[PDB]
Amino acid sequence: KIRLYQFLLDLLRSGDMKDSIWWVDKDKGTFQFSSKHKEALAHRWGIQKGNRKKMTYQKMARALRNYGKTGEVKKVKKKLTYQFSGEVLGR
DNA sequence: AATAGAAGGAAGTGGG
DNA sequence: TCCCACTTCCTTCTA
């Protein structure tokens, strides 16, 4: 199965949920979720994973925070905004 | 109060 | 056995 950060990067490259997620500065790898439409994207993540329960944004962001230590995704001090690492961006 | 974003400890589930 | 990569649950704090 696909990793959460790759799922998000794939969405950003494809544009298929442009109303739920978008680049802020793609050169830097910063991206931002929609306040009003992020849940639809969280639902898709859960369904792609086949999880038992409905996925929520809160649980999705809980997983996102676990990347902070290893570095694939880091929280940015801006509403609903995160940043991929250069390594993730290159791959 | 109502709403929302952000946080993380702890325990459960998957597939190695 | 025991880590992977989250998922789920619950509670806290700030704005």
Side-chain angles (χ1 to χ4, degrees), chain A residues 2-90:
Chain A
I2 183 182
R3 297 188 67 180
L4 172 54
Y5 73 83
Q6 190 64 64
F7 168 81
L8 297 178
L9 186 59
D10 289 350
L11 278 182
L12 280 156
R13 288 179 174 147
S14 85
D16 192 46
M17 299 195 79
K18 269 184 216 80
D19 297 334
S20 300
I21 194 176
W22 46 82
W23 291 117
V24 175
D25 186 333
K26 57 200 161 180
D27 288 39
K28 297 183 179 174
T30 50
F31 62 94
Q32 174 180 53
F33 294 102
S34 173
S35 177
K36 265 195 65 61
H37 303 289
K38 58 192 184 311
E39 294 302 339
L41 178 158
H43 293 157
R44 179 176 302 201
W45 169 236
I47 284 170
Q48 181 166 135
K49 286 291 293 293
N51 296 337
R52 175 179 39 256
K53 310 268 178 176
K54 181 193 82 183
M55 174 62 56
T56 61
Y57 180 80
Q58 181 168 338
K59 292 189 293 191
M60 191 179 75
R62 178 67 185 85
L64 277 186
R65 284 192 298 284
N66 288 337
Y67 290 132
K69 199 179 182 307
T70 46
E72 292 90 341
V73 182
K74 284 175 189 298
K75 186 66 181 67
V76 167
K77 299 287 200 187
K78 296 294 193 202
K79 198 161 288 257
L80 290 173
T81 308
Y82 294 79
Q83 188 171 14
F84 299 111
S85 61
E87 292 85 336
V88 168
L89 293 176

